[PDB]
Amino acid sequence: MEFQAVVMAVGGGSRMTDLTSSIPKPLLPVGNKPLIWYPLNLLERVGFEEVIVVTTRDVQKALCAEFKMKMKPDIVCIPDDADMGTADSLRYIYPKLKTDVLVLSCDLITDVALHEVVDLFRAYDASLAMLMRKGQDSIEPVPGQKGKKKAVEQRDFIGVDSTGKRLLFMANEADLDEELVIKGSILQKHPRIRFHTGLVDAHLYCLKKYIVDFLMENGSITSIRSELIPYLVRKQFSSASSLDIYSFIKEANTLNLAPYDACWNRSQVRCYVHIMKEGLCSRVSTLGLYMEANRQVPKLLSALCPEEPPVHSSAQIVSKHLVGVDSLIGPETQIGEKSSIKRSVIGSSCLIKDRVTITNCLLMNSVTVEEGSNIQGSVICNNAVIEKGADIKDCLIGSGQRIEAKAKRVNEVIVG
Amino acid sequence: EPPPPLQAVLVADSFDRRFFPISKDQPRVLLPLANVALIDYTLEFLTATGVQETFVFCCWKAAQIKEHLLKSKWCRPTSLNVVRIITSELYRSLGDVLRDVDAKALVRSDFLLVYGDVISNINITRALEEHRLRRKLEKNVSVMTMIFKESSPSHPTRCHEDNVVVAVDSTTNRVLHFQKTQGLRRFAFPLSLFQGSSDGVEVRYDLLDCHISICSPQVAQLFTDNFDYTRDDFVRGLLVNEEILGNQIHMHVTAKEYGARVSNLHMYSAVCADVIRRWVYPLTPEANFTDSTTQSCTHSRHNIYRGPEVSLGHGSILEENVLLGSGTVIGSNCFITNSVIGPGCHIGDNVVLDQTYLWQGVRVAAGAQIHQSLLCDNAEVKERVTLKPRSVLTSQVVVGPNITLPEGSVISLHPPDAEEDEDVKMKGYNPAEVGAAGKGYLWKAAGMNMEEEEE
Amino acid sequence: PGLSCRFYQHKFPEVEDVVMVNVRSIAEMGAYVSLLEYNNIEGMILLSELSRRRIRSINKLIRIGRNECVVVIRVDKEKGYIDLSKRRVSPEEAIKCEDKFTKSKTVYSILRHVAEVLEYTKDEQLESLFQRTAWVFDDKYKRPGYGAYDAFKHAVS
Amino acid sequence: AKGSELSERIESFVETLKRGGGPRSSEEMARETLGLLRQIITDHRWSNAGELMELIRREGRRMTAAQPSETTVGNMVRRVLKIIREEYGRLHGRSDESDQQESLHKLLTSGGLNEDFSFHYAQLQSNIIEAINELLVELEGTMENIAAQALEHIHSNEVIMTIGFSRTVEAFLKEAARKRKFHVIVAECAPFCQGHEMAVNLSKAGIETTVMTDAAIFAVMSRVNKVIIGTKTILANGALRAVTGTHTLALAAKHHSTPLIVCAPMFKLSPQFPNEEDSFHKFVAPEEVLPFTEGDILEKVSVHCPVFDYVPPELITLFISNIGGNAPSYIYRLMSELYHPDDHVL
Amino acid sequence: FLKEAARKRKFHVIVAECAPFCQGHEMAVNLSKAGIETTVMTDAAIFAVMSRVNKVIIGTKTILANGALRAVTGTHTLALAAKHHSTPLIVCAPMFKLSPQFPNEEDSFHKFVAPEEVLPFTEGDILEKVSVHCPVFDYVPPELITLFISNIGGNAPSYIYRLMSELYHPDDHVL
Amino acid sequence: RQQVPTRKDYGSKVSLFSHLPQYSRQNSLTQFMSIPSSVIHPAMVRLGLQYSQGLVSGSNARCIALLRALQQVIQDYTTPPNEELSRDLVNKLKPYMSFLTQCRPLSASMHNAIKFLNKEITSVGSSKREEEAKSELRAAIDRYVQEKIVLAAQAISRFAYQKISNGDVILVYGCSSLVSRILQEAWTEGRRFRVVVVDSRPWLEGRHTLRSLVHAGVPASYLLIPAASYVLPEVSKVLLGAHALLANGSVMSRVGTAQLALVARAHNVPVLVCCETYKFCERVQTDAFVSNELDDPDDLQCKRGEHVALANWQNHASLRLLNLVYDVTPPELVDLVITELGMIPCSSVPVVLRVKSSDQ
Ligand SMILES: Nc1nc2c(ncn2[C@@H]2O[C@H](COP(=O)(O)OP(=O)(O)OP(=O)(O)O)[C@@H](O)[C@H]2O)c(=O)[nH]1
């Protein structure tokens, strides 16, 4: 087997603690489907037939709860109380690993051709292959963050070669004292280094098996994205030849099989990257990213699963002429007459009365809205209920919260 | 509103002692590279690029520079490049020259700033057009355009002293950071470069400094304002103080054209080798761009340039990349390769010359073995003399018979450190180092710190 | 439309009279050209009268579609034969012919534009217009071509 | 006025020859040289033909030494010298000419010649200027005369191979393509890949054209019916100084007995034999062959970039000029009636 | 050979008539029935047309021990014309046509048929003083042959000797 | 799905080469294949990706890479319960070779290695256990690499050491590992000589050779192929490497090799060809048109000045770019062939094959 796909899905949401309380992060309903469905579905269209999904008890229960795929997952549970990292999870599931690993994350919504990365892993015999997207700017208001309060957002400095594929430099602004230092010999080997700051890490690493073998004998590394990848990039130019990473490489490079008796146009560790400047590639880890992904999902869902209609078959809508093309309706979801839904995703088992305008909103399951209520650019959690004529704009209402009738709360996080 | 004719400011003084003690008796701009003075190379480059007025600023040995210039091709009435010589004893840096340029109001529009030791065939028309377009679109923002040449860091024309690393916004070719990598093993770039441009902040170490600039008069104005300012000081101050003054420095990179500065002996050797091997075409030894009767030659196979009235001994072999000055007499069974020999030289029999540069009037006795050595005007070498690599003999220096001067040895008629400390007790020529009938003094690491001794 | 008229009054040139011609075809005896100043009447530049030195091919010095200044050496109004020589034309005569042709063409263009404005449709109308305006000045000043242009220049002011 | 402008124009021409040359073609080079020589004849003061010839030779020596590879300047200088000789002999009472000027067995047997240019004739200048004007007129149509012979050397569905970018060959092929259909294969002629441009223009005319590197000349020659090339210079024995890689193309054509046709005008004929002179090839900077970004590898490697190739006359089948078609064995005659042997060495 | 090639490829065939027995005409008709663009010409135009011919493919009657050919008449001229233009000459002959007889002499090489084919009997008295000869076969030296295609594959004419030794015994060369 | 989709032709081809495929390096075959490699073994997919992108080039390098990939495929092979190894392995290897051909037409060395491996697999007894057969096959492949390439190269270098003399000027073309090894070992053993490296667009493989010749300290000149006629007066020997030697003696090599042979013959210069006997072929070619490889036409674009000629060359309907890869040198232009069996005439190719076939 060439690869063994692994989905890292313990659950984060450090910047989404408001939503990661009613349900785990992998189970967030992006486009009327759980979030973890989007990575796995990718592996379906690619051709995978076996995954090692490291999750918790609830996510494993959800995975067996009539989840829709054709491949057979191998769900592995971990002690929730125990604190671990992604590298720790790889250390845990090491006995199941026999070939090269393809590590993903349960937040990546993308329409990228996976081969674009995997070919970089194949042709160049790369130790590591990464996927990044060009930096993008969010111009739409986050539902809940309105008084600025913008963080510093320590940028990642990524220096690639002239070809735009090889990874030469990788640093984080937190570790730099206002000075980006280059080793010098790196510039001697690669005189030109393109530098990017806004690149988004999609967490789609393709790691060789000896990387995990080296991870076995080293416990200092706990995270893959923050520690393993920068360590590999640094060791790329850390000369050659606890035990170092270079001792675990015991396979001859396919590009240098016979150093003599043949011509091929020291560098054993090689990290490559694919920077995709166009198309959809999002990592749902913030409220704004989640809302943007919900907004842009309908085209992806129409392309990936044309069989599924945008409106569920078992949906009772009196006004079946006031729903936008991008709007999605889940199962049940009784919607009354004279109710207009424009570019909004509606969950399942939702109670919608008449004279309700849902503009650019995200409604979860068991969401009730009464007569005359208008919602614009807002997110409703599970089991939440809306009273008569309540006007909501850019608000995050938590699970089971009750809003007073005709209470015009705007840009307020209503969390109980 | 057509721009006025292009003008150039040529600095004929290096304002440093990088050629000591050879510069004690001869200005740097008059040192013959392939039998042609460096200032002639610079003036030919300026004339070819379309410069109509040239201001030559001479401080050190300005009389000799003026005397040489008056006889040159560019001081003739038929020349389209009018050369005006300005001399002063109060010049100590390029800052002084540019401050005097501002005080005299010599330049009204964009001009060329070069030193008198720049060898190049670059046509500046494209870079000048880009500079003018940038200044037209954004008024008085971009003030200087430096010219760089694509090169690998391992090329022999890239000494560690003049190596630079540039952080550049590749979208607009704007220089954001400029640093010199002499003695460094880890280059530090401030994060302030990554403020506005989120895509192109290319860190380039493949740029060779041609030391050619297209400067607006704002450059002279800023040199006057900042009286503490060399060009590197100006560039660093401009890049640091971009907040106070919204001035910018851009760059133009040429790949198909040659350009370099002879700032030390290593660069001199590299540039001479490149010139002999036609890397600066059409500035080749046979082209006779100086229009002098004594500097004409014919170019045979293997880049062998032979002048008129050159006698070659029987059995002599000129391997490759050899330039022979007019009137040179070479003995029998000689082996000359990668060497430049000036006019009037006399070479004995069974003499081996490898990567050596003999200037006018050098006499070499039979049986000598010279490798990577420079022999200045009228130097003499006796029999059974071996010169190890990077050995320099200055003017009127004689080396006695049966010696083997080690690597890095410099022998000059000037005392090694007497007048250096004095800046009276005539010291005899030590035969233990210059031999019998040897005239000169061994010049140790006191002046060797910036001589032909490096990687 | 295709309105055309002679630049001068007389319908045919005279011997020893430098004229502007346009080469139209190549033949055995010489180059068949059209006289530009005389309503494009046929003439022949003789092969013998082409160069003082020996010439091997007529195409060496004659290109189809190129104007030439040639001196008339033989006129037969009955047969319609006009013989032209390029060897006998001096450079000063060529310059004079060029200037005269330029002036005459300017006058002809002015008169043709006037006729087009007046919606003239036949060459007889253009000939009459030339009779009234240009050739009157030409034979008043006793200088064909020059006189009409000089009189027109005397106008405006 | 006269001198202050004439000397300035001479200096400008010499400097342009020394450094560059611009996009100037061979026809433009010849026209400018002829204009220079005409102004020298008109403006400068010369009493007899001897002084004029000495002055013209003195100017031509400098013009030629400016750029030896540009032989059109020397060709035009020698043409003007021959014109002066012819006019003076005509005015000196020698009856027929262009035959006694050249050494001949019949001339040697039946007498000889005793040259003397000391006599003064007031009508010499006008005759010389008229002859130069005739030369310029011929220059204005030499290209059309060459192109007019296209249909006599190309048949239907023929494969024609060419190297480099020659405007004469381009006009020849475009004239042929109006009435005929044929396939053209152009070698790129590295390092200056001018052939690429030659392939684009021929493609704009609707001609089925194919581009290939110089390495594939021998491989493709087996299926090539005719070879049509330009040249920079035609030497006195019929040899060629063409673009680099033309000798290889000629050898490949000779292997398959493919005819090789050289479309070159009259002013490209130079009376200089390829004896030696060490001034045949023109070596441009080695930047075109090996880039400067190679690195330290360049400090021990000898890179040479010759521009021109010498093609011996044995490999040439036909010369097409404005005067028609000739064999390489007749070129000597075209020498004798164009240039005087005493003017071979300026 | 040509009909097999023509199934997947398009090419133009030029057939010489090979006078006096103009069998080439038939060769041109059959190749025309297969849709191959074919052209007939006399043996006088071989050299004229060879300049535009890329390949030569011929049969043979006998392959001699040194790689030479005993082919139809006019084949030596075709081989010379091909050698002038360096056109490859391919001989498509099976294994049983290989003969261990060297072309030393034996005065039994050519086969002279009646001169009726060359000069008709109806010429008259002109035939009583005119010597008419009609050889049928031509000797093609091995230097003009590029390749031999047989049922065992392709070989150079320089390897034919080996195909001799493994097919015939030297003691059986002279029956 | 089960069959790999055929690679698409890039652009219009020359009418004389319309029977050969023409592919673009950017359009790879892996776009429509499953990332977890099914149908085609992952080693074969990686090898084909390296072939189609030009990462692995050269006859010896391609053959060695193919043999290593085949070793990987054999190691991961399980015999079906109702099948025999001798037939199932041969049947299984065929789609892999078809995919490799789609990625890039196979070199002669690769074809000969494939034939040898198929013969070895067929000759496996049905009574042998699966693991024993796999170990024997891997050992056979290792022996093939060791004897046909490494020891052959050493023997060829030893033989060619005799031809090289002091003061010689040897002209080499392109990149050939055998030629570079011969020159390096001759320089090490004490011979003093110059090497002139002739290079050609667009691959510029000769630069490779140049670099090696400087690491060994050999003096080296460098120039392009059109200037060859200028440098051949100095040259005393031409030393070429061959991608294949055909049964009729023809040398199938990089395009321009026959050109150099012709010009060297015109300049009266001996031409030597270095080739391992494992690259000798039973096919015959009379020209470079019947069988050849058409590389990416876009590689013919050049950067001259600020403009770029041939940019958007597909917009011109009558414009075709011909990036020929190979060419055929007739045996009359080759003076000598140096193989592990010694120095032989160019006409001794068919006999050597026979000598190497009577054993098998
Ligand atoms: N298997 C496993 N997955 C984890 C673990 N911690 C977080 N994850 C998930 O795996 C993804 C990748 O890890 P990181 O990108 O480093 O996440 P993080 O460090 O917790 O930072 P945040 O994404 O902001 O929460 C995260 O998005 C989490 O959802 C873990 O310990 N084990």
**How does DSSP assign B7-64, residue by residue?**
EEEEE----S-TTTTGGGSS-GGGSEETTEEHHHHHHHHHHHHT--EEEEEE-TTHHH
* Token pair of D296 as six digits: 């330290």
Report which of E16, E22, E19, E60 is spatially closest to residue E157, judged by C-alpha positions.
Answer: E60
Rounded CA-CA distance C70/C50 in Å is 10
B396 burial class (0-12, 13-18, 19+ CB within 10 angstroms)?
middle
State whether residue F79 is helix, strand or coil: coil
Q: Judging by DSSP bridges, how do beta strands A206-207 and A100-105 pair with one another? A: antiparallel
Give the gap in angstroms from C-alpha D254 to the nearest C-alpha of chain E.
9
- Experiment used for this model: cryo-EM
Rounded CA-CA distance F217/F211 in Å is 10
Quickly count: other Cβ atoms within 10 Å of residue D109's Cβ.
Answer: 8
Rounded CA-CA distance F219/B391 in Å is 25
Domain edges within chain C: 17-91, 92-157
Length of chain B: 455
Amino acid code (one letter) for C125 = Q
Complete edge-to-edge strand list for the sheet that includes strand E62-63: E62-63, E69-72, E137-140
- The CA-atom distances, in angstroms, between F101 and each of A122, F66, F326, F355 are 18, 12, 16, 29
Rounded CA-CA distance A353/A336 in Å is 5
Is A359:A295 a contact under the CB 8 Å cutoff?
no
Rounded CA-CA distance B280/B287 in Å is 11
Is D182:D160 a contact under the CB 8 Å cutoff?
yes
From A6, A7, A10, A287, give the residue whose CB has the most ligand 1 atoms within 8 Å, as the site to mutate: A10
Helix axis angle, D124-147 relative to C91-117, nearest 10°?
60
With residue B234 as reference, give the H or E element that holds it. Answer: helix B231-240
Q: What is the DSSP letter of F151?
A: I
Rounded CA-CA distance F327/F287 in Å is 7
Rounded CA-CA distance A27/A41 in Å is 14
Rounded CA-CA distance B166/B202 in Å is 8
- Partners of E86 on chain D (C-beta within 8 Å) are 222, 255-257
Cβ of residue F283 closer than 8 Å to a chain E Cβ: yes
In a shared domain, residues F312 and F163: yes
Rounded CA-CA distance F43/F69 in Å is 5
Rounded to a whole number of angstroms, the CA Rg of chain B reads: 23
Q: Which CATH architecture group holds D147-337?
A: 3-Layer(aba) Sandwich (3.40)
Rounded to a whole number of angstroms, the CA Rg of chain A reads: 24
State whether residue C126 is helix, strand or coil: helix
Rounded to a whole number of angstroms, the CA Rg of chain F reads: 22
* Token pair of B217 as six digits: 């008069």
Contacts of F236 (CB under 8 A, 6+ apart): F168, F169, F170, F269
Beta carbon pairs, E and F, within 8 Å: 39
Q: Judging by DSSP bridges, how do beta strands B369-371 and B385-387 pair with one another? A: parallel
End-to-end Cα separation, chain C, in angstroms: 32
Helices (H), B371-416: none
In a shared domain, residues F168 and F126: no
Helices (H), A179-286: 185-189, 209-217, 229-236
Rounded CA-CA distance A301/A303 in Å is 5
Chain-chain contact of A155 with B152 (C-beta, under 8 angstroms): no
Backbone angles phi, psi at B85, to 5 degrees: -100, 125
End-to-end Cα separation, chain D, in angstroms: 28
In a shared domain, residues F109 and F218: no
Rounded CA-CA distance B283/B298 in Å is 14
Number of DSSP helices (H) and strands (E) in chain D, helices first: 11, 11
Is A91:A107 a contact under the CB 8 Å cutoff?
no
Rounded CA-CA distance B198/D208 in Å is 48
Whether residue A54 has its Cβ less than 6 Å from ligand 1: yes
Rounded CA-CA distance A258/A256 in Å is 6
Q: Look-up: residue for tokens 């240039």?
A: D339
B328 burial class (0-12, 13-18, 19+ CB within 10 angstroms)?
buried
Hey, which residues does F320 pair with through a beta bridge? D210
Matching CATH number, A4-265, of 3.40.50.720, 3.90.700.10, 1.20.1740.10, 3.90.550.10: 3.90.550.10
Is B376:B395 a contact under the CB 8 Å cutoff?
yes
Say how many Å lie between the CA of residue A86 and the centre of ligand 1. 6
Contacts of A267 (CB under 8 A, 6+ apart): A236, A240
Range of the domain at F160: 156-358
Chains that touch A (3 or more CB pairs under 8 A): B, F
Q: Look-up: residue for tokens 């895509």?
A: B199
Is A322:A354 a contact under the CB 8 Å cutoff?
no
- The CATH fold assigned to C92-157 is DNA polymerase; domain 1 (1.10.150)
Whether residue A55 has its Cβ less than 6 Å from ligand 1: no
Rounded to a whole number of angstroms, the CA Rg of chain D reads: 22
Quickly count: other Cβ atoms within 10 Å of residue F354's Cβ.
Answer: 12
Amino acid code (one letter) for E156 = A
Report which of A7, A105, B454, D130 is spatially closest to residue C91, judged by C-alpha positions.
Answer: D130
Report which of F279, F263, F285 is spatially closest to residue F339, judged by C-alpha positions.
Answer: F279
* Token pair of B304 as six digits: 């062998």
Whether residue A225 has its Cβ less than 6 Å from ligand 1: yes
Chains that touch F (3 or more CB pairs under 8 A): A, D, E
Q: What is the DSSP letter of B259?
A: E
Rounded CA-CA distance C64/B253 in Å is 51
Contacts of B449 (CB under 8 A, 6+ apart): none
The number of folded domains in chain F is 2
Is D53:D124 a contact under the CB 8 Å cutoff?
no
Header resolution in angstroms:
2.7
Whether residue A26 has its Cβ less than 6 Å from ligand 1: no
Q: Judging by DSSP bridges, how do beta strands B248-254 and A206-207 pair with one another? A: unpaired
Cβ of residue B193 closer than 8 Å to a chain D Cβ: no
Rounded CA-CA distance A79/D267 in Å is 94
> Concatenated DSSP letters for F156-219?
HHHHHHHH--TTEEEEEES--HHHHHHHHHHHHTT--EEEEEEE-TTT-THHHHHHHHHHTT--
Q: What is the DSSP letter of E135?
A: B
In E36-99, where do the E strands start and end? 37-41, 56-58, 62-63, 69-72, 89-92
In E42-134, where do the E strands start and end? 56-58, 62-63, 69-72, 89-92
In chain D, where do the E strands start and end? 158-163, 182-187, 208-212, 226-229, 233-234, 240-243, 260-263, 301-303, 308-311, 318-321, 324-326
From A30, A38, A86, A130, give the residue whose CB has the most ligand 1 atoms within 8 Å, as the site to mutate: A86
Cβ of residue F314 closer than 8 Å to a chain E Cβ: no
In E28-169, where do the E strands start and end? 37-41, 56-58, 62-63, 69-72, 89-92, 137-140, 147-150, 153-155
- Partners of E88 on chain F (C-beta within 8 Å) are 286-287
Q: Judging by DSSP bridges, how do beta strands A281-283 and A108-110 pair with one another? A: antiparallel
Is F272:F333 a contact under the CB 8 Å cutoff?
no
Q: Look-up: residue for tokens 């004490």?
A: F190
Is D217:D248 a contact under the CB 8 Å cutoff?
yes
Whether residue A223 has its Cβ less than 6 Å from ligand 1: yes
Which CATH homologous superfamily contains domain B7-265? Spore Coat Polysaccharide Biosynthesis Protein SpsA; Chain A (3.90.550.10)
Rounded CA-CA distance F350/F360 in Å is 15
Rounded CA-CA distance C135/B12 in Å is 75
Chain-chain contact of E52 with D222 (C-beta, under 8 angstroms): no
Backbone angles phi, psi at F134, to 5 degrees: -65, -40
Is C141:C151 a contact under the CB 8 Å cutoff?
yes
Length of chain A: 416
* Token pair of B385 as six digits: 């003399």
Report which of A186, A215, A188, A155 is spatially closest to residue A6, judged by C-alpha positions.
Answer: A215
CB environment F164-188: b (16+ within 10 A), e (fewer): beeebbbbbbbbbbbbbbbbbbbbe
Chain-chain contact of C53 with D129 (C-beta, under 8 angstroms): no
State whether residue F91 is helix, strand or coil: helix
CATH hierarchy code of domain C17-91? 2.40.50.140
End-to-end Cα separation, chain F, in angstroms: 38
Greatest CA separation for chain D? 71
* Token pair of B270 as six digits: 């590299």
- Of F155, F188, F209, the last residue of a domain is F155
State whether residue B399 is helix, strand or coil: strand
Contacts of D96 (CB under 8 A, 6+ apart): none
- Partners of B190 on chain A (C-beta within 8 Å) are 178-180
With residue D66 as reference, give the H or E element that holds it. Answer: helix D49-66
In a shared domain, residues F147 and F187: no
Whether residue A283 has its Cβ less than 6 Å from ligand 1: no
Triad C90, C96, C97: Cα angle to 5°: 85
- Partners of F256 on chain D (C-beta within 8 Å) are 214-216, 218
Rounded CA-CA distance B351/B368 in Å is 5
* Token pair of A212 as six digits: 């995990």
Report which of B13, B228, B4 is spatially closest to residue B106, judged by C-alpha positions.
Answer: B4
Rounded CA-CA distance A301/A305 in Å is 6
Hey, which residues does F164 pair with through a beta bridge? none
Residue nearest to atom 11 of ligand 1 (CA): A105
Length of chain D: 346
CATH hierarchy code of domain E1-166? 3.40.50.10470
With residue C71 as reference, give the H or E element that holds it. Answer: strand C67-76
DSSP percent split of chain F into helix, strand, coil, nearest 5: 45, 15, 40
- The CA-atom distances, in angstroms, between B300 and each of B320, C55, D346 are 10, 44, 22
Whether residue A133 has its Cβ less than 6 Å from ligand 1: no
Is A336:A372 a contact under the CB 8 Å cutoff?
no
Chain-chain contact of A2 with F31 (C-beta, under 8 angstroms): no
